[PDB]
Structure formats: structure tokens, C-alpha cells
Amino acid sequence: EVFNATRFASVYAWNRTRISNCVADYSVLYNFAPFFAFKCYGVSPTKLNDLCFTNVYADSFVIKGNEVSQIAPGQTGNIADYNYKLPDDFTGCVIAW
């Protein structure tokens, strides 16, 4: 329901969905999107299915091409400063398709 959405909000108002009380199988994320940026910072992309997380936040927003590389901890730009800023200590992954 976060990857089959039809109206992913803009970056200026990034919808934040709270994911809890569920088993997080990432193959359902793997099959829904032909990725182009599945970079991870705090955890290993191969090693997601063997960890338990207290809570998972899924911020979804459609954005331009270069801005995909813009979105990363410790970055700059018109989006990284005024629209969405990833904290330097980010423990999670980003997905772009």
C-alpha cells in the first residue's frame, strides 16, 4: 500500500507512513519496483530479513533524476536544504524507481 499508491505526494509535503505490527518481507518491495537506486547506509541490503526493527517510517515522494542522488545523508541542494533533509545518522534505505 506504500508502493502500489497512485498519488505519491511531492517532496515539499512528503507523506510519512508509520509501519508497525507486521513482518517486513523485502521481496514484496523487490518485485514491485524495477529499482535504480537502492542504496543503504545503516544496514546491508542483503541483510534486511534477519533484523527486528522497533518502527519503520516510509517517506514517499516523486522527485527528479539528479535529486535522487541529492537525497542522501550529509548532502546539499535546493531539496536537501529546503524540501527534505536526511539526517547524518540515518539508519535505513532509500528506493528510487
Partner 1 sequence: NDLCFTNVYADSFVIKGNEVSQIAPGQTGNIADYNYKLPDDFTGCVIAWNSNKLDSKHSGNYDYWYRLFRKSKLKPFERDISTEIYQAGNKPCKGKGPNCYFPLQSYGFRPTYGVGHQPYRVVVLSFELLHAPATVCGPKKSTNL
Ligand X SMILES: *[C@@H]1O[C@H](CO)[C@@H](O)[C@H](O)[C@H]1NC(C)=O
Residues at the interface with ligand X (CB under 6 A): 1-5, 7, 9, 15, 17, 32
Q: Which of 44, 56, 57, 77 binds partner 1 (CB under 8 A)?
A: 44
Specify the residue, 30 or 82, whose C-beta has the smaller distance to ligand X: 30
Q: Give whichever of 40 and 80 is closer to partner 1, judged by the CB atom.
A: 40
Q: How far apart are CA 32 and CA 11, in angstroms?
A: 21
- Closest distance between partner 1 and the C-beta of residue 18, in Å? 27
What 8-state DSSP symbol labels residue 27? H
Residue 74's identity, in one-letter code, is: G
Our finding on whether 46 is near partner 1 (CB under 8 A) is yes
Residue for cell digits 517510517?
A: 57
In Å, how far are 17, 52, 95 from 21, measured between CA atoms? 13, 11, 22
